[PDB]
RNA sequence: UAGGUAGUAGGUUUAUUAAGAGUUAAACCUAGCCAACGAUCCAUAAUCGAUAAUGAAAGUUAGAACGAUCACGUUGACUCUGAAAUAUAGUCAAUAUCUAUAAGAUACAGCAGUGAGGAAUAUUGGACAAUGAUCGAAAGAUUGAUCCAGUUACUUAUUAGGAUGAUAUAUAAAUAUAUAUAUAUAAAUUGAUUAAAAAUAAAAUCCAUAAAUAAUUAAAAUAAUGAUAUUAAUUACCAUAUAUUUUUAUAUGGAUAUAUUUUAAUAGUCCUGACUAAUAUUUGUGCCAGCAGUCGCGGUAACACAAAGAGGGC
């Protein structure tokens, strides 16, 4: 059983009464004006508790369930204000106990209905400089900085790349006042990352889950036979999971173990370049039976899965 | 793309990837997706309706069906068994729409470089977005781990900032601001003691959420906190604004205005050449949507971001930012697996 | 490339346009007997000046020949046999041997 | 289509690669021994058994394999000019250069192919012996008695 | 129920239902026949297409016009 | 080009975006018919160089994939390359100046970069 | 379709061929050979893929497009040349047409195009610039192969505008920085009298890009040659220098009146009783008119017919 259902607020609100014939109002519109509060002459909603951004590193995410739709508070004292019979805003009769002791997890949860979505922690401008100076000057490896500050190696590598862009921008006076104002505002809206805080630290043991292993194989062995991760790896014909983690930590450009030389074994010829020639020929050795465009290959151009790519200039090209 | 029609309808109450005021009320009043009493088809349809409204509404159904991938990606923490704390179940089905997160337009929205996915598309199409230094003008460009993308600073400020008022609109706000200032100078001069007493009591309830108290302490150092009759006398009355006289003449208007907070510039038009409200202030209702992604590292000073990885599901968490719970995404996944059968 | 020097056989553009042939003497007003124009104007300029596809390509080929000291004498385009193309020669010949020699 | 899965999901085909040497060479000792080996008889035999007349007008035995001598192939196909002829002419010089390059290429092709074939037989022989040794080692580990085997009930005597 | 006997260009003679309110089909009128039976009429296994050949579209049809050969009103 | 066995380009790709297979083919078979062998690929459109790269001195590169050993074999048995394939093989250093013609003979043109064989 | 076969099954020899064999021809012998696991006969059909469609898969379907193979070039047979042809050749005959009336020529299943048939499938286009093919010592010539464009939503893909936005006036002393601005007055489209909406929808405001305009200009191709072509792309007075992932920024030479081209945004179609997503109601019709994939709907409160409002798909 299903029918169309107008999305009325789940919480109680003041419905429309008898209306003058020319108002032509809706119960949805009046519920929104009650959520928003009065609009001043400047076009602002100062009474709504979400109109202005937080400035204390604590996100102000909507909590309709805990406040039962009461979104109005005094713009300076931050004291709850509710609608009364007179049509004015005043103190609530009873304090809301659900809004005074909120769990730590909920504070970082932006969407009431999804507790698996949480905001990330912003890194302070100091930790970023420390990470930048350790990888670049002191010459530490990304694996070391990752294991020290509790940050995943890709994030560590990204911080170095971004701090380099901020130096060039600051070296050419490209960071304007507005950009500085915006950056600081956004910094004071998110919980700052604390390398010492154990819970704030990012897990460093995560590996991609393969597909062949996703199945459930079971072995019946002797009651006192030892079976461990290495034995399981042999059964599943995969490298041990610890080895996978170690190989994934040596991928960072500044990480230890980064190596790429086994491929430098392909004969290449650069054709002679003569004055007046607009391009150079590069020849790459290949093998008959592998090189070439195959004959009778599937044409997908008229199919929904037609292959679309992008060239070096960023232009959309058919592959 | 699909034409944008009735995206912020209150009766439908669909939640969109935007910071719009009407879209905040729809999210505020939703109270979850109702799946009770519905047949399996009705449950699946409802889940599809809600999820697609948020995740890639601009994509046509047939295009989305092609893009949709049955394979979802999770990670295995190899230390869980070495902790001892109660393990949490991985929300695998919150990865149903993860394939969209690698799109350039979605990446811009998650980085807070645009106020909505729709705006992100227009920023990309108009030539304001670069990936790895190359200008990309196709919203459907897919990012790979490690890619860096940037947006022209003026566009990001226009998306995260307040709207620029027009000259006529901002000239009526200054008229009212002058009237309400001359009322504060007439109440300060008629009974200075009460006004100062009220002024001191207001600064006690600031809570430090209002930085005006910190600035006020400076002002008390610019002149024990005891009354001073020189204050009321110092206060002066601003001159009224004749909207008609200074109509169509901004330089004249911005020379007749001199308020203690707004001096020689019309409200919100300190630099009429800039494309946003000046001096720059955050857009209204930004806090409820300001979510920092786990899969991007953002540098707001330069408007640069790096695509760290494709969002993944882990015990107790999904990096795919969604306003809907796992049961809804599970139904949505069930629908698309079978092409809506 | 560079501007070759006028010779005794080809003193000016008008002589050049007459030796190459293929009705290229009808472009003498396009060039205006300017030696440099003949050896500087590329296809794009000639197309803007109204030279048709076949003639402008032919001129540029003969300009390259002259620049390399290769003969610029007219070479004629092919023509079908007097008795017609091979596919229509049997029919044509049969009707030409019954109206000339009977 | 589904058929592509059998070929690495490669769509379309390539022409069959030609063989530079169309027959086994005289240096492929392994093949030479196999053909010389006496042909089996009986249930899994090949050929006419002693006393069984073959069809009249037919050859009792199979034609002998033609083994290529790469030295003789090179001598007959790309023989060198017998005299150092006087190539004063421009066209003679061009032809001499082209003939020299063509001869160099085809001689390198025949000798690289023969080497590849011989090197491939040796690599297979080494690889097979390794695999055989590894299988014996693996099997020996399987047959090794562990302490857990004590908990497996047995009736060896019966 | 309005029907019509029709001789198809392949020599088969069929009975086709004429849908819609009102029709201008007569004898010798050129009609185009599609599949689809008239459930309550036994032996009428086909439909004539409105707005094709000599059969006009339903007069004054407002809804589902494409199914009745009615063009869009300006 | 003469002979029954020719090395020539077979056209692939889409309208306005030609790509080519370098093939050994019977002279009489269709240009795009399945050949005797596919020796390589030729992409005629040079890779575009950025404004900075241009001033930096980067030259656009046309990319050819080729089986050097197999190509030499087919030249050895008398396969005859087309004019375009001949130019490619002379630039690769497989063929020499004996295959040049009077029209393309670069007898006097300065060499800015000499053929370089590397490993990559 | 139950019996079929009579060079038929096998043996021997000659002829013929580069070559085996009742493959063809000649001779002489044996009585065999095929068949209810389907012979013989009849009907139908070009075959297939690392191609397309579908499915979890085994499979099933197609055989247009890409590619491989076969056959044919109005019909039949025969011969010549040749390594290879019962050749799109030649010979004779058949059918049709034509003009030169000859033991004549032609046969569009080459391209374009026309009539016919059909529910239904396009230009009597451009160029040999590219890749090939033929001829030539070369210069070069030829090429409806081929490359391009035209026609056609037949298929696929991208784009086809974002942020803000529920009213308008009057209103208010005569710079330690204010601040929950507050009052009146008028206006307020369809539906409806409250969970009944249409509706942030519209207008309006802010900011853009496309196109245009201007300059510039690759690449397909080079020794030279560009059909496509009014090229793509880029830049917004043009040029230059310096610094300057990108990019940015400064300053310069010339260029206009301290500033510097202009500037947008009108979707259709089906459906809302159940299967099956569609609750805001209302009018006409009255087992009629009509609807219908299935169950069924319609006899005066029709959620199903015909419509308005509202709503759901794509
Ligand atoms: K899909
Ligand atoms: K049968
Ligand atoms: K066809
Ligand atoms: K050509
Ligand atoms: K619609
Ligand atoms: Mg329903
Ligand atoms: Mg020749
Ligand atoms: Mg015989
Ligand atoms: Mg026979
Ligand atoms: Mg006989
Ligand atoms: Mg047939
Ligand atoms: Mg089949
Ligand atoms: Mg078939
Ligand atoms: Mg066809
Ligand atoms: Mg034939
Ligand atoms: Mg025939
Ligand atoms: Mg014939
Ligand atoms: Mg015909
Ligand atoms: Mg035709
Ligand atoms: Mg017809
Ligand atoms: Mg032509
Ligand atoms: Mg009314
Ligand atoms: Mg433009
Ligand atoms: Mg050119
Ligand atoms: Mg209907
Ligand atoms: Mg009624
Ligand atoms: Mg229905
Ligand atoms: Mg109806
Ligand atoms: Mg309607």
From Swiss-Prot, chain A:
Extra remark beyond the main annotation: Present with 3460 molecules/cell in log phase SD medium.
Functional note: Component of the mitochondrial ribosome (mitoribosome), a dedicated translation machinery responsible for the synthesis of mitochondrial genome-encoded proteins, including at least some of the essential transmembrane subunits of the mitochondrial respiratory chain. The mitoribosomes are attached to the mitochondrial inner membrane and translation products are cotranslationally integrated into the membrane.
Record GO biological process: mitochondrial translation
A Pfam short name: Bot1p
Gene this chain is encoded by: MRPS35
Major site of localization recorded for this protein: mitochondrion
Gene Ontology MF terms in the entry: structural constituent of ribosome
Entry annotated with the keyword Ribonucleoprotein: yes
Name of the molecule in the record: Small ribosomal subunit protein mS45
Lineage: Eukaryota, Fungi, Dikarya, Ascomycota, Saccharomycotina
Subunit and interaction comment: Component of the mitochondrial small ribosomal subunit (mt-SSU). Mature yeast 74S mitochondrial ribosomes consist of a small (37S) and a large (54S) subunit. The 37S small subunit contains a 15S ribosomal RNA (15S mt-rRNA) and 34 different proteins. The 54S large subunit contains a 21S rRNA (21S mt-rRNA) and 46 different proteins.
Keyword Lipid metabolism: no
Subcellular compartments: Mitochondrion
Family membership noted in the UniProt record: Belongs to the mitochondrion-specific ribosomal protein mS45 family.
Cross-referenced InterPro entries: Ribosomal_mS45
Keywords assigned: Mitochondrion, Ribonucleoprotein, Ribosomal protein, Transit peptide
PANTHER family for the chain: 37S RIBOSOMAL PROTEIN S35, MITOCHONDRIAL, SMALL RIBOSOMAL SUBUNIT PROTEIN MS45
Swiss-Prot record, chain C:
Protein's cellular compartments: Mitochondrion
GO molecular-function term, one example from the UniProt record: structural constituent of ribosome
Keyword annotations from UniProtKB, A to Z: Mitochondrion, Ribonucleoprotein, Ribosomal protein, Transit peptide
A GO-annotated cellular component: mitochondrion
GO biological-process terms attached to the record: mitochondrial translation
Extra remark: Present with 2630 molecules/cell in log phase SD medium.
Quaternary assembly: Component of the mitochondrial small ribosomal subunit (mt-SSU). Mature yeast 74S mitochondrial ribosomes consist of a small (37S) and a large (54S) subunit. The 37S small subunit contains a 15S ribosomal RNA (15S mt-rRNA) and 34 different proteins. The 54S large subunit contains a 21S rRNA (21S mt-rRNA) and 46 different proteins.
Similarity comment: Belongs to the mitochondrion-specific ribosomal protein mS41 family.
Function comment: Component of the mitochondrial ribosome (mitoribosome), a dedicated translation machinery responsible for the synthesis of mitochondrial genome-encoded proteins, including at least some of the essential transmembrane subunits of the mitochondrial respiratory chain. The mitoribosomes are attached to the mitochondrial inner membrane and translation products are cotranslationally integrated into the membrane. mS41 is involved in telomere length regulation and required for survival upon exposure to K1 killer toxin.
Name listed for the protein in its UniProt record: Small ribosomal subunit protein mS41
Organism annotation: Saccharomyces cerevisiae (strain ATCC 204508 / S288c)
Name of the coding gene: FYV4
Coverage span on the entire protein: 29 to 130 of 130
From Swiss-Prot, chain E:
Main location: mitochondrion
Note: Present with 238 molecules/cell in log phase SD medium.
Protein name as annotated: Small ribosomal subunit protein uS12m
Stated role: Component of the mitochondrial ribosome (mitoribosome), a dedicated translation machinery responsible for the synthesis of mitochondrial genome-encoded proteins, including at least some of the essential transmembrane subunits of the mitochondrial respiratory chain. The mitoribosomes are attached to the mitochondrial inner membrane and translation products are cotranslationally integrated into the membrane. uS12m is required for respiratory growth.
MF annotations from Gene Ontology: structural constituent of ribosome
GO cellular component: mitochondrial inner membrane; mitochondrial small ribosomal subunit; mitochondrion; ribosome
An individual GO BP term: mitochondrial translation
Gene from which this protein is expressed: MRPS12
Taxonomy, superkingdom: Eukaryota
Keywords from the named record: Mitochondrion, Ribonucleoprotein, Ribosomal protein, Transit peptide
Protein family membership: Belongs to the universal ribosomal protein uS12 family.
Localization of this protein: Mitochondrion
Subunit details: Component of the mitochondrial small ribosomal subunit (mt-SSU). Mature yeast 74S mitochondrial ribosomes consist of a small (37S) and a large (54S) subunit. The 37S small subunit contains a 15S ribosomal RNA (15S mt-rRNA) and 34 different proteins. The 54S large subunit contains a 21S rRNA (21S mt-rRNA) and 46 different proteins. uS12m forms part of the decoding center of the mt-SSU.
Curated annotation (Swiss-Prot), chain F:
A Pfam entry, by short name: Ribosomal_S16
Gene3D superfamilies attached to this UniProt entry: 3.30.1320.10
GO CC annotation terms, alphabetical: mitochondrial inner membrane; mitochondrial small ribosomal subunit; mitochondrion
PROSITE patterns: RIBOSOMAL_S16
GO aspect biological process, one term: mitochondrial translation
The keyword Ribonucleoprotein is assigned to this record: yes
Recorded GO MF terms: structural constituent of ribosome
SUPFAM superfamilies: Ribosomal protein S16 (SSF54565)
Key words of the record: Mitochondrion, Ribonucleoprotein, Ribosomal protein
Coiled-coil stretches: none
InterPro entries in the record: Ribosomal_bS16, Ribosomal_bS16_CS, Ribosomal_bS16_dom_sf
Family: Belongs to the bacterial ribosomal protein bS16 family.
PANTHER family reported in the protein's UniProt record: 30S RIBOSOMAL PROTEIN S16, SMALL RIBOSOMAL SUBUNIT PROTEIN BS16M
Function (record text): Component of the mitochondrial ribosome (mitoribosome), a dedicated translation machinery responsible for the synthesis of mitochondrial genome-encoded proteins, including at least some of the essential transmembrane subunits of the mitochondrial respiratory chain. The mitoribosomes are attached to the mitochondrial inner membrane and translation products are cotranslationally integrated into the membrane.
Quaternary structure and partners: Component of the mitochondrial small ribosomal subunit (mt-SSU). Mature yeast 74S mitochondrial ribosomes consist of a small (37S) and a large (54S) subunit. The 37S small subunit contains a 15S ribosomal RNA (15S mt-rRNA) and 34 different proteins. The 54S large subunit contains a 21S rRNA (21S mt-rRNA) and 46 different proteins.
Protein name per UniProt: Small ribosomal subunit protein bS16m
